């Protein structure tokens, strides 16, 4: 997070750090479904926003429908609509790498759907994603203020927890068949306890 600057914008990056604060996992409305009592028909609508696609698109802010095209009333069908999970997290520079006596730097990462609760605060994490900007940095309309800039964040797609000393993430190693054969072989000797004991320190 300290060595991530404006020259890396719009490019794919991989950052390391410590998770400091997560957010509540919320649903996002994608498709609504309705019912008309006077006709017996079902209708629907789709919704989108700026963070669901990598390329810029022309906004289409559709409204939530309460009536029919003929004036009849509508009823919401919550069981037939669609919702998607959403979360936002913060990543900071690791305590074992940041300079001493200096205030730290951090960056926000947005996750969606199947990567929504893969870490907890305090973990060492590696996040790969696209460093992207959004909106207008006070350019539209007059907006005399010049102090603020462009809002930026990472649209994440990969999250990897990392194990360290004196941390809450446990180490696990993938076990191959060679390893299993060797372990099950050594299990059959009689001084196995002695060998395993003399190996410590």
């Amino acid at each position: 997070p300290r060595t991530l600057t404006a020259q890396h914008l719009n490019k794919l990056v991989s950052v390391e750090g410590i998770v400091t604060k997560t957010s509540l996992v919320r649903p996002k409305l994608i498709r609504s479904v309705h019912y008309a009592a006077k006709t017996g028909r079902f209708h629907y609508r789709d919704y989108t926003d700026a963070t669901t696609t990598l390329t810029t698109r022309i906004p289409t802010p559709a409204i939530y429908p309460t009536e029919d095209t003929e004036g009849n009333k509508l009823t919401t069908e919550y069981g037939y609509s669609t919702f998607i999970d959403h979360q936002r997290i913060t990543v900071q520079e690791m305590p074992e790498m940041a300079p001493a006596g200096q205030l730290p730097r951090s960056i926000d990462v947005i996750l969606d759907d199947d990567l929504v609760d893969k870490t907890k605060p305090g973990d060492r994490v590696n996040v790969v994603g696209v460093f992207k900007s959004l909106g207008a940095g006070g350019m539209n309309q007059s907006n005399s203020n010049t102090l603020i800039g462009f809002k930026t964040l990472i649209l994440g797609n990969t999250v990897y927890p990392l194990h360290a000393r004196s941390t809450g993430v446990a180490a696990r190693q993938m076990l191959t068949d060679f390893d299993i054969r060797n372990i099950n072989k050594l299990s059959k000797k009689k001084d196995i306890f002695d060998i395993l004991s003399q190996s410590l320190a």
């Binding site: 409305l29 926003d49 700026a50 906004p59 409204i63 939530y64 309460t66 909106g135 207008a136 539209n140």
Partner: protein, 41 residues
């Protein structure tokens, strides 16, 4: 039964629903403004 089409969109003054309040704002800080004479027949 001189009627004219509305000069402004009527989805703001008409508080249709609670989610209609959500739908009338999106994409960060920018306000929603449909423009002058937004209706078609």
């Amino acid at each position: 039964n001189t009627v004219s089409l509305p000069r402004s969109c009527l989805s703001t003054i008409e508080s249709e629903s609670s989610m209609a309040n959500e739908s009338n704002i999106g994409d960060e800080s920018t306000k929603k403004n449909c423009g002058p004479d937004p209706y078609i027949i």
